[PDB]
């Protein structure tokens, strides 16, 4: 009841390739750091290595796509639509304020959606920030993610 289509695997591969920026089929700690840093975080090497370690099933020190797919498909099978949105909001609400600033979310979107144009990201943010106060709060994020 939790089969994967070709298109689903390609979507998980797009998420994998966000991190595997050199395209050699593995995610290294440096590549993970490049993404996290682009989001304004500053993970340490030990923190990056621990993150790799959670997904690296064969222990060779990097994440390959079968490891990534295993983790992502299991997460998808185990988490409902409302729960996964809730958790994703808390990932991007770094200080736990209940808000993501419009400027922060724009930067997140530009870096995670690499082929988006500025016009497209602008439209997404304008739609997300329902009341236009320059912040995307929790319920605004839920509603943007459920539409």
């Amino acid at each position: 009841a939790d089969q994967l289509t070709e298109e689903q695997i390609a979507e998980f591969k797009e998420a994998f390739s966000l991190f595997d920026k050199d395209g050699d089929g593995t995610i290294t700690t440096k590549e993970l750091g490049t993404v996290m840093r682009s989001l304004g975080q500053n993970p340490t090497e030990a923190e990056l290595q621990d993150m790799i370690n959670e997904v690296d099933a064969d222990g060779n020190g990097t994440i390959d796509f079968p490891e990534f797919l295993t983790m992502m498909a299991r997460k998808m099978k185990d988490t409902d639509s409302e729960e996964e949105i809730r958790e994703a909001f808390r990932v991007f609400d770094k200080d736990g304020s209940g808000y993501i600033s419009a400027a922060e979310l724009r930067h997140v979107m530009t870096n995670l959606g690499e082929k988006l144009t500025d016009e497209e990201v602008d439209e997404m943010i304008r739609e997300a920030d329902i009341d236009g106060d320059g912040q995307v709060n929790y319920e605004e994020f839920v509603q943007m993610m459920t539409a």
Partner: peptide, 26 residues
Amino acid sequence: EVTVGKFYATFLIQEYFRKFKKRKEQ
């Protein structure tokens, strides 16, 4: 838990991009 969540949130945001492009067109 935390690590899985970070990777999965990226996918969920990419999924939102896909749906947004579909709604903008149709």
